[PDB]
Design a protein around this nucleic acid. Sequence first.
DNA 1: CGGCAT
DNA 2: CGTA
DNA 3: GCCG
Length: 330
Amino acid sequence: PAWMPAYACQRPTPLTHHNTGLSEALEILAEAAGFEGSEGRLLTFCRAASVLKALPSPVTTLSQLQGLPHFGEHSSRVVQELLEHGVCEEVERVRRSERYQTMKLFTQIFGVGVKTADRWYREGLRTLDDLREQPQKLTQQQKAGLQHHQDLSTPVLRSDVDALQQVVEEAVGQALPGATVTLTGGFRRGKLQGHDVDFLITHPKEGQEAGLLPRVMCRLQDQGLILYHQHAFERSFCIFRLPQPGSWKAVRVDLVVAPVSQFPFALLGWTGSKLFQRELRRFSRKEKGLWLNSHGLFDPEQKTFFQAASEEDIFRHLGLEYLPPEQRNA
DNA sequence: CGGCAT
DNA sequence: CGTA
DNA sequence: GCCG
Ligand SMILES: O=c1ccn([C@H]2C[C@H](O)[C@@H](COP(=O)(O)NP(=O)(O)OP(=O)(O)O)O2)c(=O)[nH]1
Ligand SMILES: [Cl-]
Ligand SMILES: [Mg+2]
Ligand SMILES: [Mg+2]
Ligand code: NA
């Protein structure tokens, strides 16, 4: 064989695709690699999973893997076992292990990463109740993640997004006339549910957006909408008290402010997917010698930044065919 | 061998 | 360390 | 784990 470029940013990956079972097994091994501190193995298994998402058809025979980037002996054996038996022993052993289940439980708490989760695991902790019993071990961020864990485990729906965008737009418009709010993250790629809602805020006049995020946060807090926030800043990782009929639920909301000169770069970065953006930044540095992030695209030889008005401008400058957000689901 | 996004 |  |  199939046409398959080596970088995920070089091929469309739609929201709905084939090979979900194969990819899900490889993503288990990727997650497990991360839990053991092997970020390189995590990347390869993520990349191999992503290749299967971009293929035109279901993989039914091992021969359909011939020539594909990021498939070597290990990833191919996993697919082979799934095709020949419907299960992969290594994947089942990982999935059912106490280590994997506990690390997954702890790292899905807001404020907990692999290193913290592993420290707790080595100390004998296994459940969220164990963590509540030892609050000396917890940052304020982790306390918020634990306190709202049940709600944060509930998928965020489009109806939630629409309600949240309205209250964010109200606060932004109170804080700075003419400022705008753009939905980014997974919902912009067409995802129907998510773990949070991500919003990008800017203003058409360069510089007007300075100091905006603290003013937005104060106005949301005054409406009773903020359960948790981190506190001059450009990114806010919040938990909102989202009104529901007769009640409310906690929802993670991320806010990012960019000057309008940087808006295309921030929109590109925050629309994702995470793997798509890692691969795009890798492509930029290795194939073009340019450094890419949410602020800009830097040429370290001329010592200049590329001026962009659109995401299309950035793809074109990197020599890449443009992909709309719904084809960035790597 | 070492990189693996910023 | 955590976060996007 | 895979590859530049
Ligand atoms: O490590 C990261 C995490 C996120 N990002 C970018 C891409 C990602 O799509 C976007 C928003 O991050 P989220 O964690 O909110 N992921 P997403 O919105 O894609 O999915 P969901 O929120 O449903 O998990 O920010 C990175 O660049 N690096
Ligand atoms: Cl960034
Ligand atoms: Mg998101
Ligand atoms: Mg987010
Ligand atoms: Na976490």
